[PDB]
């Protein structure tokens, strides 16, 4: 599977945060669900009794 990977790579801009010698990417997916019928699966309901 690893050797099946693509060879060419492109540059693109994004935001990252440093978390103790560990850098991760931050993203919101507002673009995908902007005017669609589907709900964003990161917006959820929670029940307490």
């Amino acid at each position: 599977l690893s050797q099946a990977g693509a060879h060419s790579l492109t540059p693109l801009s994004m935001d990252v945060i440093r978390l103790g010698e560990k850098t991760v990417i931050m993203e919101n997916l507002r673009r995908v669900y902007k005017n669609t019928d589907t709900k964003d699966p990161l917006e959820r309901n929670v029940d307490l009794t």
Partner: protein
């Protein structure tokens, strides 16, 4: 639209058409002049200082 998983309901194509209209609001202001002012503007008498 967002493609759905197998068995879920699918999103129909939708066309939305909207019209928008204009509004009107005029303004006005008067100014007035006196009869003596018009008399001395229009005509002159025996020439004097």
């Amino acid at each position: 639209r967002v493609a759905s998983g197998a068995g879920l309901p699918t999103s129909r194509q939708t066309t939305i058409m909207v019209t928008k209209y204009s509004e009107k609001s005029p303004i006005t202001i008067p100014f007035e002049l006196s009869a003596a002012c018009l008399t001395y503007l229009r005509e002159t008498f025996e020439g004097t200082i």
